[PDB]
Design a protein around this nucleic acid. Structure first.
Ligand SMILES: Nc1nc2c(ncn2[C@@H]2O[C@H](COP(=O)(O)OP(=O)(O)OP(=O)(O)O)[C@@H](O)[C@H]2O)c(=O)[nH]1
Ligand SMILES: [Mg+2]
Ligand SMILES: [Mg+2]
Ligand SMILES: [Mg+2]
Ligand SMILES: [Mg+2]
Ligand SMILES: [Mg+2]
Ligand SMILES: [Mg+2]
Lengths: 344, 104, 99
RNA sequence: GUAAGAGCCUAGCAUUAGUACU
RNA sequence: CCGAACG
RNA sequence: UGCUUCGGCACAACUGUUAAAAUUGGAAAAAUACAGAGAAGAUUAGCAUGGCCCCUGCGCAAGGAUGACACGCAUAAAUCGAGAAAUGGUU
């Protein structure tokens, strides 16, 4: 219609925020010797893996936070981690240009996916095919046969580092976000972008799918946008700006969107209304700089009740819902609908 | 300043690392968190169970020879050292111990 | 392992269905229900003096296991029916009595 | 003193298509 | 035990 | 060659990148002569980066002067408006 017309529609009909209980940080785990950069939860929900700038992958007990195992095989930072839901496999990528399949029955690297020309930044397992997708500084999403280690496909078109990656079973089966400020939705059968989304002004460092809805969120240093699938229809911006580079985004089944800032902020938003009900800043562990405070990864556990964050003060932090909270004792940041008339 | 971009008869040069290996995939069986096995359970029950177990079962509750000597009691007052993580490159304890060990 | 392999717990691996015999199930069910056609016998001897093999010859004459025998003389070993535990097997020794 | 290349002359690898008259 | 290339 | 009513049937079925050539062109090398080596004073170890540069190598090694090149020599005008003053037209 217009920006004015749509702004009046928006003042009338914006979905109100669903009340979400606040989250509190209940656990710091020290022990990585570099920035914790990636997290991944195992589908059983009993351990998580964190990769680091100290080049290791640590396996942690999800309920005690206990170091179960350290895995060394990367030469540089571990930048991405993906635990398979269908295979007893963990996948890691790293700044060493290397993608590794870890056999979790051996605790050993059994396959290596060779071919990234620069450091690898993002990883994604196809949820239904035995295929993995990695993006890196060579601006390219490399699509790998899990079994034969073969590079089945190269998704070309981005211009800078592919920083975020999504994989789903419906079309578009790969979503990438890049430092070139675009999101490509890919047709995995054709090897071609099915859509290029140019609404972001900064680089898209975080993508997240909605667990249940056909929609994803992308996050920049400037906005978190929400997009409808298959075609990547812009739904909306979050109703506030985390004034931070967002490194990580996780979405819950309750629709809690967690976004984690390069400055160590953690904002919790209502998916579906776009409204942030919580805003936190990290505390950095003793010794750290407060410059060294970013929030590089976050995942929810499989139930959605825990959020594990991988931080630049080299900690894993764990957050649980203060779910003994009720919309009366704990509403959080309160909502004013987007009443403005603005230009879009 | 700018990396190489990595876009994609076939060449018949065969690498050694590209010879067949691990030619079948392991799948998660019944007992290794397989997807059909995991819909069946309440993972929140097991998580809150394990967290309560950990958090409670870590809490554990439901004149002499030394008369000319000029200094007495000089160890008393010394700090007993602690298992702590300092996020400092050079001011952590591994490093202080390392430099103590290797520099004489 | 971080994902424990779901292992065949190789203790003593038997076969997955009652085998073919020269009699039925109900025939033995009959011959059991009357004391005057049942003899209980333990077989004993020295070490190796032929006990396991005699029991095996009985099995060989009253059952259906010929291609088993072909697998035995192709693999190069003679059968040991009552020596079932594959660790009592690989010592050519009966370790625990079996009925 | 490396040893690189530019060129000059002379300098033996690949190819099987094409040749008309108001 | 045991030898070749390269730098 | 069988079978043959000796008339004939049956069977068997399309090689050749067609050259002992003809051109035809492009090539590495050799000599010659040219000229003849990173970094900041000098002398020197390298490891990179980028790609219509390759060579040696089985190479996802390693090497080739850190293999070379590039590498800036920025005669890359990165360039212009503010105001007073003063002078010019017109009344
Ligand atoms: N020459 C000969 N050897 C035999 C005969 N029967 C069995 N054997 C051999 O004797 C070996 C030992 O006999 P087993 O079948 O082990 O009988 P066993 O005496 O119960 O031995 P244990 O199992 O140790 O008690 C076998 O492996 C055969 O090679 C036979 O009639 N003649
Ligand atoms: Mg070297
Ligand atoms: Mg050298
Ligand atoms: Mg080098
Ligand atoms: Mg080299
Ligand atoms: Mg040298
Ligand atoms: Mg070089």
């Amino acid at each position: 219609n217009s920006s004015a017309a749509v702004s009046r529609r928006i003042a009338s009909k914006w979905p109100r925020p669903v009340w979400h209980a606040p989250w509190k940080m209940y656990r710091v785990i020290s022990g990585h010797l570099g920035w914790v950069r990636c997290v991944a939860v195992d589908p059983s929900n009993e351990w998580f893996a964190t990769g680091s700038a100290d080049r290791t992958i640590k396996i942690w007990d999800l309920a005690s936070g206990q170091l179960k195992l350290t895995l060394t095989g990367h030469i540089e930072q571990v930048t991405g981690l993906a635990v398979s839901s269908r295979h007893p496999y963990m996948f890691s990528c790293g700044l060493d240009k290397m993608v590794k399949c870890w056999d979790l029955e051996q605790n050993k690297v059994i396959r290596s996916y060779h071919g990234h020309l620069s450091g690898v930044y993002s990883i994604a397992l196809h949820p239904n095919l035995d295929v993995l997708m990695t993006g890196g500084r060579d601006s390219v999403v490399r699509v790998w046969d899990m079994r034969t280690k073969v590079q089945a496909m190269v998704l070309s078109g981005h211009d800078q580092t592919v920083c975020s990656l999504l994989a789903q079973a419906p079309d578009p089966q790969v979503i990438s976000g890049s430092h070139d400020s675009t999101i490509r939705l890919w047709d995995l059968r054709k090897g071609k972008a099915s859509a290029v989304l140019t609404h972001h002004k900064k680089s898209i460092r975080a993508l997240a799918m909605h667990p249940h809805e056909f929609a994803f969120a992308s996050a920049s240093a400037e906005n978190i946008k929400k997009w409808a699938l298959p075609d990547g229809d812009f739904l909306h911006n979050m109703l506030s700006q985390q004034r931070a580079i967002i490194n990580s985004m996780a979405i819950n089944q309750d629709g809690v969107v967690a976004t984690g800032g390069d400055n160590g902020s953690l904002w919790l938003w209502d998916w579906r209304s776009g409204h942030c009900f919580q805003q936190d800043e990290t505390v950095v562990q003793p010794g750290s700089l407060e410059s060294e405070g970013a929030l590089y990864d976050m995942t929810f556990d499989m139930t959605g009740s825990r959020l594990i964050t991988a931080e630049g003060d080299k900690t894993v932090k764990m957050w649980k819902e203060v779910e003994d909270a009720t919309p009366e004792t704990h509403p959080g940041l309160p909502f004013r609908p987007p009443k403005d008339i603005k230009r879009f | 300043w700018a990396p190489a971009i990595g876009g994609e008869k076939p060449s018949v040069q065969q690498s050694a690392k590209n010879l067949p290996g691990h030619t079948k995939l392991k799948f998660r069986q019944t007992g290794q968190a397989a997807e059909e096995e995991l819909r069946a359970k309440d993972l929140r029950a097991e998580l809150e169970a394990k967290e309560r177990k950990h958090f409670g079962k870590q809490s554990g509750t439901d004149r002499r020879w030394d008369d000319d000597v000029v200094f007495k009691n000089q160890a008393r007052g010394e700090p007993k050292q602690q298992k702590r993580f300092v996020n400092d490159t050079i001011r952590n304890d591994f490093h202080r111990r390392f430099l103590q060990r290797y520099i004489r | 392992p971080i994902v424990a392999p779901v292992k065949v717990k190789k203790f003593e691996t038997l076969e997955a269905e009652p085998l073919r015999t020269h009699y039925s199930n109900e025939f033995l069910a009959t011959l059991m229900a009357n004391p005057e056609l049942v003899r209980n016998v333990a077989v004993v001897g020295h070490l190796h003096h032929g006990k396991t093999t005699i029991m095996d010859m009985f099995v060989e004459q009253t059952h259906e296991l010929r291609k088993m025998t072909a697998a035995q003389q192709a693999a190069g070993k003679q059968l040991r029916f009552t020596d079932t535990r594959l660790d009592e097997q690989a010592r050519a020794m009966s370790i625990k009595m079996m009925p």
